[PDB]
Design a protein around this ligand. Structure first.
Ligand code: SF4
Ligand code: SF4
Ligand code: FES
Ligand code: FES
Lengths: 633, 633
């Protein structure tokens, strides 16, 4: 089972599923082999009904699409629709939060409120919305208004791009026409330009894709900003991760999907319902997180993380998961089928994301506390029905220190330098105690043994003194393998990095270091990494493409991860991807994305499936930047 | 060559291309056979990097997507992205026109103006924009404002849906949550819901697709409205079609693509440049149309139509096409490669639609007359370079009467009844002289011998007294085979229909009938058909799904045609498609789109690849509606 997952709790559940004849994501992958080579290389097009068209990677005909579309056009068009789809998901998320903030300050949804007043005012100030003399509810109205207005064309470009990147970066992107006009505007224009008989120049196509990736960044940043206003900016917290956080004698409820609008409320109400749960024979309600909405409540409330991404079905296989509460994105629809076997109540809550066979409970922000009790009451009923059944919760978990928003990282550093909090970080970059910064982001992928690329690359970078930060299921992978436990700093970290992590943790009075990897939050919270890196660029007076900062989507899966990787490249970072994206069928497109895009944005993709080799390449990219700043490396 | 195209001019050029070794769309189709069966049935998914996933239509594994996505989810998600892509193209078109109207009345683009004042005021009135006491430029500002606002969420739904359908239809659609909130909003929500681990219920998915098809209708209607304001509402015109409208001794310039913003200007300036052309040795500038922008200038200016859709390359093979001026959509990118062989100058003009190897000339509405002269001067240079070369223009053309906007049809009918212009049409429906109405729309497709389904079905309906109207390349197909020449009414039309066409043409004082098929314009001008049908519903006091009106996308190709077919079904029409859409891999999805959707919208798809059989089915659908209104049939 070690070939399927490096997670020991997951291996245990794989044996249980095998015993019980429950089919998993790894079984459905095996049954799909060998996979279509035209699709894996990107050489397939179904954009019109004359299709499908395919192109042999090598050999004889077919060599060209029926309408004349070349390999490089087919490959670029497919990549562009992937980016637009990713943009649409982060965008839908952010829009949901904007409507929620508006409803809240309109007296239309009392379960919600302005919790982070300081964040509200600073966002307002960055957007140019006057706060002086204004009611909080009115400033929030204006901020929600601004969020909604960035989805479409208007007199300004998308402000959740132009106001969050340093002016030098914005000017570089404007010079190539890459600043988005509107988030949903860019998505539609991509779908237009990639439809039949439209855009048919690889460079032109890919420039459109860079601009749409910045629409995805906007949606990520907007999501983070709005969730922080509504639910609070994260600060350091300690909790646990992996299947052992389930408790046989509790009502176990997974929150799964993406939007905290839902899960934050589940968390607060579940506390209101402890006695009801106790009456039904449970110790209480055990809320646990899966995928990004689980990261959101881990970051803000210390809710333990159960599992992530590719292994999400295994939480159900324990037999102890009473409910799985979903909103949207990255939920394997297999869970609805598996539920019949495992007794789990799968509940969908959003009108645009249903799963045949799951129970659907409309979630209205207006009725949030009421709807959440209805949902938790299904959970308690389910708990009562497994009275007497044996469960198999692997007794396996790790300790997780998390909650490192950019504000929290700045505050932590401020203990070493109150008026110039970034300076201590930059001092150690310069003296070599910190070689550079690597962001791990994105998914697990069934083609890669689960977490093997994230932990292999992270180990080699940490030994090399790289400051490692993580989000989404990259954070999931590293938390489940101990990388967020400060007790593993001695084992994992090079001396220089250890020194810095220890110097900062001591100064935050905890007699021990920060953890080996800093968990910066959900995948929209990749925007936090951007804020940090942009703050560093600004403090240094250089652009981002001169900083010794890289990203790694080491086991990428979702269209969203493709969108994130592309905007990492667009804002100037060397960006590793550890799964093959469908571009290998076109050497010209590959060459653009791994090399000449350096001349446009200064970032570039690093395609490398071998994790030790990837680590080497990421170190070389870091050290090259070090060299360009005139530092030793 | 009769197996490739039923057009004799196209057959002649196919022989020339074969002789000269120039590869065509039919050669690239042959080279693609046999085509992938997973893609043709819809059983393939590439929405994440764990893919590609496929599902055997029959047999053993694989039976399910790696994430658990079932055949019916994969099929519905693919269909939904097709609809969104179609919506995005009609939407981009309409947006282009809205910005153009705004620029114009802002003094920012003098080449453009309000030409149809009456249309401006009636649109303003239907939108609720006050006109009383207001300057035309201010009303136009407000109308452009309203157009732009329908792309996004706001206090009202999309008004180019809710104000163009009768209230009873809007209430039916609202009851199922099908009214779009915003055009680009719906496109992005589709891309979101169809991304991995999101919407996974076929019924839910397809309801989203119906709503996004109404966003496509909005964009079509908005495009028609805005192009009519700027360039004039069409009125009856006489011209010609097919390759014989090219003239060896003229500068032959094709306008190709979709937006009249461009082609209308090419038309007017080309007249300014006749002497320049005469100086270079040409008789003058011969502007001819291809695909929908060619329909637009045919409808408004009587510009002859050269060719359409699948056979567009053949205009170049004549050796006489000096320039092909493009904006976006449905242009085979092969034209850039073919140009090197044929001497044609291919010119792109829109930043989001370039073709490697073509010359690009930025077109700015602000500089429209200047840019258009630069472009025509490339044309004249090209003409001069084929001095002495032999050309092969097939001496083959048809006469085309066209320009039947809904306003023109109402005016024509008004000659038989001034204050109740629709009544004479309805009288003849009732007495049986008109069996019902069929709209032919959409593309040619290389899998079908060109035009064979459109003319076979049209012949059998016309004999049965059906009033046939047509748009886009369905209009192209029928015009090129004589169906828009009033001299063929005796041959083609049943006696009842002949009677009516003759009664109306005589009353419009022309001593002869209207043509056998009424050309209602480009594919956005399918909205004109909607206005007519809605006016008929309103005059009858019934909804559209009680009218004896059907649609046929008999040789569909583009995502746009899929979008149009789906909104035809959504507003209540029996809607034929004559090519297989990728839904056959899922019987539940097929059953929804061909049968239970009747219970939701009253319309339904009719999938039939055999044209005689299709005609039978369309007649049965018409006669069933006749029966439901209590009429004989
Ligand atoms: S767009 Fe071109 S390459 Fe794609 S399916 Fe249609 S004919 Fe084939
Ligand atoms: S979304 Fe599901 S069915 Fe589609 S490629 Fe990914 S794993 Fe396969
Ligand atoms: S030919 Fe397999 S993905 Fe299309
Ligand atoms: S397997 Fe051929 S279209 Fe994907």
């Amino acid at each position: 089972q070690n070939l399927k997952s490096t997670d020991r709790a997951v291996q245990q559940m794989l044996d249980k599923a095998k015993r019980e004849g429950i089919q998993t994501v790894w079984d459905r992958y095996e049954a799909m082999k060998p996979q279509c080579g035209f699709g894996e290389t990107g050489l397939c097009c179904r954009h019109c009904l004359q299709g499908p068209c395919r192109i042999n990677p090598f050999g004889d005909e077919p060599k060209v699409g029926i309408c004349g579309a070349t390999a490089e056009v087919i490959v670029a068009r497919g990549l562009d629709r992937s980016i637009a789809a990713g943009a649409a998901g982060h965008s839908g998320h952010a829009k949901h939060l904007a409507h929620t903030l508006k409803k809240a300050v309109q007296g239309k949804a009392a379960s919600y409120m302005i919790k982070d007043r300081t964040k509200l005012h600073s966002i307002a100030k960055r957007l140019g919305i006057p706060t002086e003399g204004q009611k909080d509810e009115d400033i929030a109205l204006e901020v929600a208004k601004a969020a909604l207005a960035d989805f479409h064309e208007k007199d300004t470009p998308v402000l959740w791009v132009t106001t969050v990147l340093p002016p030098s970066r914005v000017k570089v992107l404007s010079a190539h026409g890459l600043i988005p006009a509107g988030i949903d505007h860019e998505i539609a224009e991509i779908m237009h330009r990639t439809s039949m008989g439209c855009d048919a120049d690889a460079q032109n196509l890919l420039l459109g894709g860079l601009r749409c990736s910045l629409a995805d960044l906007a949606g990520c940043y907007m999501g983070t900003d709005l969730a922080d206003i509504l639910f609070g900016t994260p600060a350091p917290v300690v909790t646990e991760s992996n299947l052992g956080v389930l408790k046989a004698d509790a009502v176990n409820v997974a929150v799964h999907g993406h939007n905290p609008v839902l899960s934050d409320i589940i968390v607060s109400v579940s506390k209101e319902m402890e006695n009801e749960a106790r009456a039904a024979g449970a110790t209480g309600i055990n809320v646990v997180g899966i995928c990004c909405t689980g990261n959101e409540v881990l970051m803000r409330h210390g809710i333990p993380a159960c599992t992530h991404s590719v292994s999400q079905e295994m939480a159900m296989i324990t037999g102890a998961l009473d409910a799985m509460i979903l909103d949207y994105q990255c939920i394997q629809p297999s869970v609805a089928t598996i539920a019949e076997c495992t007794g789990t109540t799968v509940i969908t809550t959003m009108e645009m994301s249903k799963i045949t066979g799951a129970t659907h409970v409309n979630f209205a922000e207006e009725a949030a506390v009421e709807n959440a009790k209805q949902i938790l009451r299904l959970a308690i009923d389910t708990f009562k029905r497994r009275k007497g059944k044996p469960v198999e919760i692997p007794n396996i978990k790790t300790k997780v220190v998390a909650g490192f928003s950019t504000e929290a990282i700045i505050n932590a550093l401020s203990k070493l330098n109150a008026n110039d909090p970034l300076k201590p970080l930059i001092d150690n970059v310069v003296n070599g105690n910190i070689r550079g910064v690597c962001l791990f982001a994105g998914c697990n992928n069934v083609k890669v043994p689960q977490d093997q690329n994230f932990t292999t690359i992270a180990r080699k970078l940490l030994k090399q003194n790289v400051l490692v930060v993580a989000t989404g299921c990259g954070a999931g992978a590293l938390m489940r393998h101990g990388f967020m436990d400060p007790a593993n700093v001695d084992e994992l970290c090079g001396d220089g990095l250890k020194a810095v992590l220890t110097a900062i943790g001591e100064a935050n009075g905890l007699g021990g270091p920060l953890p080996p990897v800093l968990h910066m939050g959900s995948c929209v919270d990749n925007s936090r990494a951007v804020a940090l890196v942009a703050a560093l660029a600004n403090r240094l007076g250089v652009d981002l493409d001169r900083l010794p900062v890289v990203a790694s989507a080491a086991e990428a899966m979702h269209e969203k991860a493709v969108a994130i990787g592309t905007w990492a490249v667009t804002i100037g970072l060397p960006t590793h991807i550890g799964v093959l994206p469908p571009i290998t069928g076109s050497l010209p497109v590959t060459q653009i994305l791994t090399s000449s895009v350096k001349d446009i944005t200064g970032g570039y993709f690093i395609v490398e499936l071998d994790p030790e080799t990837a680590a080497d390449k990421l170190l070389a990219a870091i050290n090259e930047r070090r060299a360009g700043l005139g530092l030793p490396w």
